[PDB]
Symmetry: none
């Protein structure tokens, strides 16, 4: 297999660092945790190093390491995330919130020693001051959803798009469309996958022994084929 | 690769049946769902078959299948719950609510065909009818907390002790001490674990399409070591 | 303040008496020393009054007064051992030496006047004459390990299990598993602690002016909580 | 509470730097660890920087921090070592090895930031290159032995005298008389103690992961009054 696969035979530490800017409200978030590609388990904890988060925590869940998705034996040849390791890949993402603003993220997912780092730069604009983001908070859906992937041959990478359902405090729903391009960092050949998807489930919680603004995230991801 | 773990290589159906008697108020609960030991995932739905539940649903979460906890590779020799399968184990518990009544539960967790069954007999007493549990709304801790386990060599089983923080409606916190003793149902050899604990996480929801008194539970449990 | 903490504000003399029986060899040990709960310090000298000890001295350290452990301010409510004083408690233990023999101990730790007395009975069996324990000269690890404690609500006492590491003459390691049960002797109320542990450190030494088979013991024990 | 005592209420890092010259053989030792005066516990690791130590490690322990001796409550007015802190004290010694050479040491024990550093200079002479010390046939005494202390009114410090037994591989015992003088470095008032002694207990071992010439030291010291 690829020299990137056996870098995930067991538990791998994760470091997260986010430098965002939403309508002028600058902020920084640091994250830390572990990941197990054998089961697709992810246990991460994030903290707003600048104090309070100006945007809702669940809106940054997707931005905050898809290389820890579990790929079954019959589909390991479609794992582009682990393929581009240890040099890693670049993750660009346009998040469009319906009837609201949009995010634009630039991430660098790579290995730094024995740790997996996710250094991201996020920009936000066109969010209303009384919109569903800069105003009333929301919550991330704890149900399984699908994240679809196809290869991008001309870019030697993969295309990834998916929808996010955010439950509003007033019983409503704010759909967030994610468009994502991934490009390898190293020059070595990567796996060009067949169109497939990932079954993703994330549970949000807090840490009772934490005084700062934070979020605890438990994520299970499993890849699945498309006939 | 101890015997009993083979019964949890995939999704296993779960049947839950409870018969309760809290302060003379008799009731029955039927529950169904499934569990995945590879991820420690737990999805169940419980229905009050006698009408309205006289106690808050969150006070009955723990009573309502720890054999679906995920034991990492280096800790599989500590899995007493799966070692008792398929003959199963008996779960007796004493749940003391601070400054209020107490529960006494007798359960039989075993395999019925391909379905993991959990038949429980619950008895409550000394509950104040005007306190904050009986006839009032409660909220489960929802965040991660620890469930401590130790071997009981005299009874050839395990002792399980843990705490639970329930959230009252006025903002106050009610604490429910749990005292638990598991013993195997058959004469086959079981696993005597070292002191360890389980990291538990639950999410409570409501079925919009269900008219009877009901509870939907999502739960994630992971075993962890004590040095 | 339960009426047991005041009995340990200063230095308290210790009496130890043990009648042992291993592979037919009947032996006796007398011990004396002091104990200070403010620091967890234990100074004890044991002497085999029946001649030579037929078992290695390190295998009897745990059998040879956990009421002298230091419990910090935030842990005083978990000190079961002190709450059973002055009437004291009973300490039954099953020690399992891996791939070798087993110890069965029964002790009554209680106050006899102004000194705390520990009177034990030991029965050993299934020890190989060429076993790792038999032959003596064993080595007790001077590093600190953890002795986990959980409440036994049914018996109105506590359950205690831990592991000790015995260094062998061959450079290897003998693991002795300990399974302990504590119940109160008197009829008053006792402390029912939360799950916690005790970091215990001990050092074996000798007395150059002592001609009989003996051992000098130095031990520090401090209580610590579990999340 | 005496002014210098507040600096030892918790664990204190320790630095040790020794330059030696025994019979023209030059060497330097670096040492590090921590001290806990609540229990009189010491754990230090020393590394010979210049390569192979030309004298045996057991001969250098005492040269290798009596300010970490535990002084019981009602004997605290006798702690000159702590009362010299933070400015520290000078510690000069003459170690006569019977029918062999001698050590001359000069130590400046003081606080350097939050770390108590013991920087020593050692000179050894008149040692027999074919005797029992230079050939490295020595073992340490792990049993408790006494260290006698007395005030020095004129020098505003203390004199310290004690004996030490060293075990040779032929079965013989080598006595090493120590003559010690301690004088404060600062101009603050120090405590002139009464005649008393320290009960010292030491244990030497080896680091299995260390390739350089080294010694791990564990020490327990406790002061005691003289009638």
């Amino acid at each position: 297999a690829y020299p990137g696969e056996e870098l995930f035979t067991g538990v791998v530490p994760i470091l997260v660092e986010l430098d965002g800017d939403v309508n002028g409200h600058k902020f920084s978030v640091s994250g830390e945790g572990e990941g197990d590609a054998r089961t697709g388990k992810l246990t991460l904890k994030f903290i707003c190093t600048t104090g309070k988060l100006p945007v809702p925590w669940p809106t940054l869940v997707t931005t905050f390491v898809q290389c820890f998705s579990h790929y079954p034996d019959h589909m390991r040849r479609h794992d582009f995330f682990k393929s581009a390791m240890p040099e890693g890949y670049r993750q660009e993402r346009t998040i469009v919130f319906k009837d609201d603003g949009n995010y634009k993220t630039r991430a660098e997912v790579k290995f730094e020693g024995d740790t997996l780092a996710n250094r991201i730069e996020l920009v936000g604009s066109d969010f209303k001051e009384d919109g569903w983001i800069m105003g009333h908070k929301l919550k991330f859906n704890y149900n399984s959803h699908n994240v679809y992937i196809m290869p991008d041959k001309q870019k030697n990478g993969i295309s990834v798009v998916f929808k996010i359902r955010l439950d509003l405090e007033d019983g409503g729903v704010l759909l967030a469309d994610h468009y994502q391009q991934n490009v390898p960092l190293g020059k070595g050949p990567v796996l060009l996958p067949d169109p497939h998807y990932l079954s993703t489930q994330s549970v949000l919680s807090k840490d009772t022994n934490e005084k700062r603004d934070h979020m605890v995230l438990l994520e299970f991801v499993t890849a699945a084929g498309l006939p």
